[model samples]
Target chain A: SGFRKMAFPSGKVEGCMVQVTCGTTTLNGLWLDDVVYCPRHVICTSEDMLNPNYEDLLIRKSNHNFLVQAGNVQLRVIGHSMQNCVLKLKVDTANPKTPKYKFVRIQPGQTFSVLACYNGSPSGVYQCAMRPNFTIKGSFLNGSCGSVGFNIDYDCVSFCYMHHMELPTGVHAGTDLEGNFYGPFVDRQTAQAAGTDTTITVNVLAWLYAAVINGDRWFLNRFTTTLNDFNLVAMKYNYEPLTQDHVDILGPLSAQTGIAVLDMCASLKELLQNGMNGRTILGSALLEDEFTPFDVVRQCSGVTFQ
Target chain B: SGFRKMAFPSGKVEGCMVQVTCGTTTLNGLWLDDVVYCPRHVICTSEDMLNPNYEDLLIRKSNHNFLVQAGNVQLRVIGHSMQNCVLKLKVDTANPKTPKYKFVRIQPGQTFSVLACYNGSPSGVYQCAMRPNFTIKGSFLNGSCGSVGFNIDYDCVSFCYMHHMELPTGVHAGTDLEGNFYGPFVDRQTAQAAGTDTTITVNVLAWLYAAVINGDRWFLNRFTTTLNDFNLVAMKYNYEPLTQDHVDILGPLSAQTGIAVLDMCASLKELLQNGMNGRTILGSALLEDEFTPFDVVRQCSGVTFQ
Candidate 1:
């Protein structure tokens, strides 16, 4: 009698044994794929077997290669307190030959720009270097540099400077490094002007949405704050009341017009756009009340009460 | 009349203009230390001098230093989609050989000890250092170390691995770096587990608040949220409920006891203390579900399908 191997769909097969009386009860055999089956053939499948239906699954499971592509680049400066704090930018990371960007000071109503510059060519990893007056220079390399299978390592360096204020406690003897305290401290009119100036500066940033753009355009809007007070007034009302004037000023010429309006809805919108507000537009005028510390004591000299 | 030089409080003497004869030019002797008065030796009354009370006027005219210390230090993270960013600390100007203080790393859900070490000692500026791994390290020093005065500088490296996410068009033809695609993307189960892990990490930080002292016991309570959530279940009308033992062996632990009830309240209180209520906790497991690109696709595989 002809015998065929019984197959089961559950990846296993079982067959009943048939009795054959050829001398010593030999079982009929069946052959399948280079293997001979006797009685009941039991087949085991190896995990490595590529099934015709799931070939792509196996290939996909084994395929893992990293790829990098050109994408967006952004730099943001939330806010800086020290009026004199400067952010210097440099492009050439291989060597500090000559600083492309220098002494970028951040004032009350300004913002700074950080961009990845290429010679119109796709460079491997663009590095943006930032240096503060009192800290180690920081180097930020573009994250888009690496091989397909290896981990990419990026590094940044941060430089630091001394904080401006030292509360007079006999505990820590504070040193006056600048020697000229008058330069750092604001004058009376400046203190008064600071109030109005802060409002105007914030208005200008809101009117223009300073943080969303590059520095060159930021400089123009800053000039407008002084010349026409476009954003200057925007800061006073916290950029709200969403007046037509506000929309007219900041509506166009930005990728983030809605954001600009929203920022106006928020608090004074980073009064300074980067650090441009720190730049003295018109040299500060000295008032008659401005006096030196020596002058202060001169009036108090020889005071004695009997 | 006997000729004599009288002293006057005013810098100018009323009729002592070099006593030139009418239409004639003959200089007269001048008073040395005091102002010259009429050539009379009569005793001057206090009323005549008026005592020249100029101190108050000078004080009123002089400008004092407007050293307005801004109340809080505003630290901002300028990156795309950086929610659970960890802020680190480092000293940029500490002595190279004998550093005044070292650095330490801080993770998410962890509260930074602003003055963790070197308490009561007069040290210089300290600042936070944040890295891409969402880890933070801080540093301190005795004084500013450069040509400029002592100032502490801080730069928080963002946690977003893709330094260039949206590259401007036409900059380069080469593709992005290969290493930029290294990710930790896993399945949803793993993502959920990671979120739970992050939550547990926050709990561990809360426990640390109970562990350490030295003025930092309550340090883990500064963050805040902007939303609220609450749901409670009431028992059926006088009907016996199934014993928790039938449902779960640990169901009893989930049940409310006096201590367990209080502990739930305590956790809520702690969450509130750290501003972790309905408000968004960046990088917190609580926000894992809200994350764009899904945690698995963005973090694990660095692959986002449109």
Candidate 2:
């Protein structure tokens, strides 16, 4: 018997717009698959769809209130003018006649994130909506006229939007360290004037030991040790500009400068490569039980630093 | 005490570059802060400057396995592709040096989604890598290709970017039906061509009722009740396009022959608007819960089937 190989298209099927037109009125374009149809026109079967475990997924609930635990939620809503546009969280459920849920309004230009407990999973559905120009205040706009709509061009478009997190071990229903709430912690760097005695050297001991070195190797071990547990999240450290006082101080040390400290941090990539090599050949003994030396190296070498 | 806001032009700083002038050597720009003199500078203190929660605020995780629950998880990769690409999930945290994540190579033109269990919370630290043309059977114009790499153009940036769902209940983990496992929910329309049919409908009945009846008074009240427990979880349905044999049988009775059914569904929006208004006004009492005279007319006008 001969074996047959399956083949598929080699290009992307661009989503075309399906617009509703009656005479002159042109309604919105529904993406090809957006419209709903009965049985034969349906897309997927129940068995094929992924089922989530709703029991373990707990929404932080509060006492005597409808609000659930905010769980250190942070929102960065980039809109047009920082004016009247409002962000709202509303629930839509119930009512044989008309069902609408809890509605929370948001302010414009103002970043909103919360760390609070909420009650009631609401047992229904909810959606995020935007109401442009809800606020009457005129001061938010710096010398601009007229209310502007909140710009959300990328709301449903192409973007790797992040709004949730992975749960930490043995830490359920309670608060943990702020850093744990979100990993790959942020590091801020402020620059000083040129020709100053400014020098920056990141120890990289914690990051290296915790992330690249120890943290990485532990993932290679099997049974009670897994790489999936390694949560050395990317912590971006930014270097801001310098202050005026630094100009005077740097005049003397400026000669030996021109060495950007940020670059030094990046140089560790080579160092890590060497370190990885050493661990692969010599450290192969440590990981001999579970995985082959080749597999061990493959996993270790996959670590990337940006 | 008088507090004044002062604005200053943030000084500019140069960056260290990888220069090819002399071999492949990286040249240092300039270092700003000294770790020894100002230990405060050595360790970044201000968290706000760093946007500490950016990662946590976005990316989420589910089961520790490579596969995710269909439609519950989604991958939105944005970048120009040189050729075909495949997306796979891996256990990013299980190890650091040698990560243990799985890859489900996805080829271009063939799009499919599945469900996998993410054993962690959606806390934004998730990372994955992508390999364009994972299998290099044929040589390209460029150099040899690896699993993943970075380039000035068409580089695979954010191979495994984190995602956050607007609906909280959808990503919980467990063995139960509602446990943490979400999509790889292939789009319904995609499946339609392949001859599977399953459909889903998310009705905003409250708003629909209100619009149909043209009721403004108690619209909010009715809407709230109807939409009480509604949570916005993306749905993935199966689709099977109507075959000619099936279409011939229902064509006369339904009068929705061939592709015409799609147009009829689009026209239903107007009908839906009217239905909303009728339900809102007469179906429920407004204000003091008093039944209005409009109820009688609504009852009489029921079931107008052509």
Let me know the TM-score candidate 2 reaches against the reference structure.
0.16
Find the 10 residues in a row with the least total lDDT in model 1 chain B. Answer: B1-10
> All candidates' lDDT scores?
0.19, 0.18
Measured over the true interface residues after superposition, the C-alpha RMSD of each candidate is 47.6, 29.1
The alpha-carbon deviation from the true structure for residue B91 of candidate 2, after best TM-score superposition, in angstroms, is 13
For lDDT, the strongest prediction is 1
Cα lDDT over the full model 2: 0.18
lDDT of 1 by residue, A240-278 (tens): 223455446545433343344443433232333343232
TM-score for chain B considered on its own, for each of the candidates: 0.16, 0.15
DockQ of each: 0.01, 0.01
Name the docking class for model 2. incorrect
Off by over 4 Å in 2: A1-107, A110-306, B1-306
Query: Which tens-of-lDDT digit does each residue in B92-151 have in candidate 2?
Result: 222111212222322211111111111211100111111111111111111111112111
| Candidate number achieving the greatest TM-score relative to the actual structure | 1
Q: What is the number of backbone collisions in each predicted candidate, taken in the order shown?
A: 70, 156
